[PDB]
Design a protein around this ligand. Structure first.
Ligand code: MG
Ligand code: MG
Ligand code: MG
Ligand code: MG
Lengths: 247, 247, 252, 249
């Protein structure tokens, strides 16, 4: 019933307005703590070296000069009158799938909710080009999905990662419980000079359309299905522990 | 044989000098690409929104105004004459165990090595700061040698923690699971020199029960801990509870 | 007739909305390039080491992640179709008087206009606290600025000089008049407050003890304390010309 | 006798090692508070919105994550055991003349010293490029600055005025002399170079050149172009006094 919202696109981004409309279908007790600005690539980082600055827009909406992870902690530990029952992060402008999950500020917001002991869901909306994001699709489908998930709980320590395909609402083919996909890791550095002549680089990622696993988040979205992947924060490769020849 | 080093403590930090002495026990072909400044809590974030600035100290040592993840990408894709055979990240001033792994720049350095297709190890030294660097320094070379000698699986990185003991006092080594600690985030509220509010975020140690197979338990016992980690975050066991759809 | 606006309070600050209303009393050809956020203390600094990021709000309003000086240069050299005839900077939330001038982003916005060859005016509005909130009587700058600027533009003033305008904290109909003032001099009371962060590491806040000491009767400060609008002509030649001849053996 | 040094080039920059050598010709009581990194274009800005972080290198050398202005305040009010008698700011890598003075971190260091009630001098060294390596003839400032500052300190100068010193790009023994100059007026040569980042998003670099135009024969610029050291007394009253009477009206 007490729902806390954050995102990585910023307090003023349309995706967050969309999330709050989704949230209000589930409860009236909604709280928003979101970054001041875009947080692309910020992953699960938080702000320890500099002060956090909190800006109140109204008694339920706050912007924070910090990461999504900072936002969730601020919400849970300072802003709300008690722990939220659900944390929602998004709706991101652009999908978060496969190896994105490690780098995603939207996914990290949910993670943080989960580390704080709260049920948490990340939501991301695939689009096409500039951006025409079919927000109505997440908006039409997210409420009932979250309602069902909340009704059937899910395990402690696991968060849900939802991606909505670039389709019109009535065109989405269905929903699938997926696994995290894998794409080729295509990091690229572009070297330039700044006009006082000093070198610098831009980092970006080539995002190829290669084959992925048929049960992946990617494959689902390519098929026009909503993807729901349960994710956890234990990174141990348990199957590997036994070797250990010789410890 | 080609070894790339990075850390989160910065190019000038003693932990990185320690790592390079360790690395030189394994090969003379060592390359260093490390942040300009000491930077906690950066996790697996990278720098997309601003330029990266690379600074050459000598032919094998480079500082980068960016994250450990940026450092590994720069090293692999731009600075080295070909892919390294091994990426080492650390030796961090402070342990990285249990829920730290999600937030650790030191660990993310290794994660990035792995995502680039390279065997990778993160190394961290528990302290009280008085950091008993000599302990990691005494024990790391042989451990890494054995690990390299035995393969380990593709997609898995190793997370090594050394206890706060004198070198001759360490009790042994254990292949461990990632522990789970209680989330212990603290916000201190203040007012700046102009009266305006701000917050400091920091973390205490939390109060969880330690599993006897965890990284934490090993370190508490005076043992070196080695946890194999992987980058598939799917909670596979949970997928089947999909009511009511496929996967 | 072509007017460019900027400020140091940010694209979304009320003082900039105020300045645009004033500007529209003087022309319909108004352009706005302003910082994304608050710029206190940024003086005449500009951004050389990092990229500038421009954001278009509409055809005449742009936010820039940079300083008020960066804004003017962006406006003059990139955004507008030709040089503005007038650069206005403000209306700042708080006065910019005396030793402030060297540090003020608002004043710098005008300085940059002037160095770019354009008539330029900085506007600032004095306020009072209740007791933490600022109550800024924007209506005062709003009521009085249009005619003052119109008269100044009509009479013209020398090239290389910018005007620095302060409005007192009075209701519009209470302002006692306007004075051409000199820059005042306040006691310089910079203070360092030492603290420890959440992890125990030291840091400092820099702040300034303000205080009501006596100033020169022809100063900007004195005028504002009297309830008068202050107009100080400023220039960008810092040479202490009177002191050059004073010599310990060399030409010039 | 107590001398505080700062710069805009940063605690590790050669120009600050040069300045300390110059300073030690004048006193053995020298204190250094300088920025952690390069501070081009920071003018007289200071740090109000974020914390200042101070780092001790030696008992006499400190780096501050902040502006030259912040450094001088820190040095005067906190680090030194009492006010310095002299603040020196530089030796900058590159001249600071004419309309540079308004933008210059090095000059602002000296400005702040003056506002804090201390005699202050900014020092800058003109250079040239060999391709892209700047070759800065530091030896020129080094050779000439100690005596000039000695004389200046021996003769007083007025309260509220700072001195801006520029050394020409000449070999030490080739400098033609010294001149008390006026601040020049250059052409403002700014432009904006538009690019796209790794993700396709626009950004600009702000390029500021020098003007390339004729200047007054008594300016800092004309002196330096002639191979002379330039010394310009500057003050912090920006009032255009000659214009006030005109303006009422
Ligand atoms: Mg986003
Ligand atoms: Mg560290
Ligand atoms: Mg302001
Ligand atoms: Mg410099």
């Amino acid at each position: 019933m007490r729902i806390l919202l954050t995102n990585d696109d910023g307090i003023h981004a349309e995706g967050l307005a969309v999330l709050e409309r989704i949230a209000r279908k589930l409860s009236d007790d909604v709280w928003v703590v979101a970054p001041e600005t875009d947080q692309s690539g910020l992953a699960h980082s938080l702000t320890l070296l500099e002060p956090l600055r909190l800006r109140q827009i109204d008694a339920r909406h706050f912007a924070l000069r910090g990461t999504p992870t900072d936002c969730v902690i601020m919400g849970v530990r300072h802003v709300l009158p008690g722990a939220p029952d659900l944390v929602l992060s998004g709706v991101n402008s652009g999908a978060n799938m496969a190896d994105d999950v490690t780098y995603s500020g939207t996914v990290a917001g949910a993670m943080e909710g989960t580390l704080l002991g709260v049920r948490a869901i990340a939501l991301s909306q695939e689009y096409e080009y500039r951006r025409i994001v079919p927000w109505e699709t997440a908006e039409a489908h997210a409420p009932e999905l979250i309602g069902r998930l909340m009704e059937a709980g899910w395990p402690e320590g696991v968060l849900l990662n939802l991606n909505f395909p670039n389709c019109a609402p009535e065109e989405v083919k269905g929903v699938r419980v997926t696994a995290q996909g894998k794409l080729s890791h295509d990091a690229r550095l572009d070297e330039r000079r700044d006009g006082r002549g000093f070198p610098y680089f831009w980092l970006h990622f080539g995002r190829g359309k290669a084959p992925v696993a048929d049960d992946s988040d990617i494959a689902a979205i390519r098929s026009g299905c909503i993807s729901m992947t349960p994710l956890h924060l234990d990174l141990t490769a348990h199957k590997v522990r036994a070797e250990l020849g010789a410890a």
